[PDB]
Structure 1
Amino acid sequence: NAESRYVLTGRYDSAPATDGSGTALGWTVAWKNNYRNAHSATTWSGQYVGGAEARINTQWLLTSGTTEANAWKSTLVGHDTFTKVEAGITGTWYNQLGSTFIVTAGADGALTGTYESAVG
């Protein structure tokens, strides 16, 4: 449903190394849509690993808007692994929590799509 989806934008290395390395990428979701606002934003940073068991392996930082007095506890950290179900990255991915990451990788390095979190 519309209510559960949030806009994402990011960037990826559109000319990765050819030495066996992964493809670096990152993206952001701000947790506001027309339905809800959690006053927070998550960024995922990680890499795409191609081949027989393709994955996007990430670490993330989730910052909430806080008063100055609460800033010390503004940021959560964690790690999400995505499995699928430029060409490599583009498609629909799910993580270990059941969240859905729908993304288009542009030839130029853009990532654009939607994120639906299974948790809140």
Structure 2
Amino acid sequence: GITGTWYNQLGSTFIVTAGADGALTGTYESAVGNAESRYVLTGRYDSAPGRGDGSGTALGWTVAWKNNYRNAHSATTWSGQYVGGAEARINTQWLLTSGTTEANAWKSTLVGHDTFTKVKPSAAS
């Protein structure tokens, strides 16, 4: 369900493998189609989401925004849940912290949200 490719509503993508141990491993591409905008992703998910009391599957992952083309001196974490079915989604909140000086630490962290889907509008060239 989680393994595969996901698209947010703003032009980013990621590919992830959800391993049997609870691992998430993949790559995050901040600009669809841009080969230079790819960063390592790692995280964790609930590998036994069933309960006796249709709940989503909790997960989280991190991207540090450093690759061979960019270093934004920052990292984002996404916390959310996977929901399967016909309109499968990963609903997330995220936090983006930048390294700062001490005087600027108060303003080191942005918050937002991303909704990831398995499909996005697409069209021929």
TM superposition score normalised by structure 2: 0.65
> Which residue of 97, 100, 114 corresponds with 1:63?
97
Secondary structure in 2 matching 1:3: coil
4+ residue runs of structure 1 moved beyond 3 angstroms? Answer: none
2-structure distance, mates of 1:10, 1:50: 19
2-structure distance, mates of 1:3, 1:51: 33
Segments of structure 1 that go 5 or more residues without pairing to the other structure are 86-93, 95-120
Question: Relative to 1, partners in 2 of residues 1:77 and 1:26: Cα closer, same or farther, differing over 3 Å?
Answer: same
Deviation at 1:17, TM superposition (A): 1.5
Residue of structure 1 equivalent to 2:69: 35
Larger RCO, structures 1/2 (Cα 8 Å, 6+ apart): 1
Within 5 A, what are the aligned runs for 1:1-120? Answer: 1-18=34-51, 20-85=54-119
Secondary structure in 1 matching 2:86: coil
Larger Rg belongs to: 2
Q: How many residues align?
A: 86
Percent identical pairs in the alignment equals 95
Deviation at 1:2, TM superposition (A): 3.3
- Code of the aligned partner of 1:8: L
2-structure distance, mates of 1:35, 1:2: 10
TM superposition score normalised by structure 1: 0.68
2-structure distance, mates of 1:47, 1:77: 17
2-structure distance, mates of 1:38, 1:56: 25
Secondary structure in 1 matching 2:36: helix
- Code of the aligned partner of 2:87: E
RMSD of equivalent CA atoms: 1.3
2-structure distance, mates of 1:27, 1:68: 26
Deviation at 1:18, TM superposition (A): 4.8
